[PDB]
Curated annotation (Swiss-Prot):
Changing S127A: Reduces activity by about 50%. Coiled coil: none annotated. Zn(2+) binds at D126, E167, H295. One of its GO terms (cellular component) is extracellular region. Glycans are attached at N16, N261. Disulfide bonds join C106-C131. The gene is QPCT. It holds the Pfam family Peptidase_M28. This is Glutaminyl-peptide cyclotransferase. Its EC number is 2.3.2.5.
Amino acid sequence: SAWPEEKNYHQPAILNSSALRQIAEGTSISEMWQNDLQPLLIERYPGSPGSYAARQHIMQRIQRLQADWVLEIDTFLSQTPEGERSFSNIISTLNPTAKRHLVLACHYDSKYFSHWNNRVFVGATDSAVPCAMMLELARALDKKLLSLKTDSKPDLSLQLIFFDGEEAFLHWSPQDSLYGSRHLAAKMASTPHPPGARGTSQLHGMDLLVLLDLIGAPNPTFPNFFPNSARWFERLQAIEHELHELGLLKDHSLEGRYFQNYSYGGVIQDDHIPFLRRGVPVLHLIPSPFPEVWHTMDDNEENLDESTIDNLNKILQVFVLEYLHL
Ligand SMILES: Cn1cnnc1C1CCN(c2ncccc2-c2ccc(F)nc2)CC1
Ligand SMILES: [Co+2]
């Protein structure tokens, strides 16, 4: 069976003008700010009070949606620099037994830092905002998504991952990093899918991994990293332009735009690595450069850009709708 190949040929359903208008009007940046983003701007390294609440906040937010979301906690112990630690990835699937899933993901953990001048690192852009935008997407699209509960469709739904312990504890290295991802990846790699199949694993299931990281500084530039996924990048470029055209953005210029058609110099380590090395198509939505306030106490809410997150919300939402033909 050649269904793992279905993703290679899969095409989008290009929304038309008024559709795009209606998506734009559908997402409230401020609803998100207050309810999605704000609660997560807390110290939330693994095992911390913040961790448990962060995790509880996310499931609270999803559980309140009507689309038949299936939540699931990948909790595991692993050795670390600071000694043994419990990690818990949050997965959220619509239609889990569907062969194919588009997958959005980020990291809910934050990096550890000593309380330099009674200040606390909350990792705004890194990646509380990614988390919020995902949860906003989940909301903004509830009605539309609820239809994926019902002959004439590809066997494809949506999945959200929120990886834990992405961040390094001490020195970033193969073994002090990507704790959450490394584990789930290996688990998926060996979990048969669909249940009772020969050969094909849950990783065959991931049509595409869309990984949001370090998002919320103004004027981010995303490079196109992956050739094997460069066509979806192009859709993102198109959608950005389209909405700009219809004037459905706020404070945006084509000269100062987000998705640039250039490649990237080095190779960026993130949650996608364990997936990508197993031949998942990845779409790495991480800005190059990173925000100024990267791994600083300045990575705070004072320093996010309201308009930038909102615009991206609009872009990412259209992308996903088109990807799912909704
Ligand atoms: C993806 N992400 C989110 N927050 N920080 C990151 C990256 C992870 C990969 N990075 C590294 N790559 C190679 C060697 C070291 C690092 C690194 C990671 C964390 C840190 F504090 N300092 C360096 C840069 C920061
Ligand atoms: Co970081």
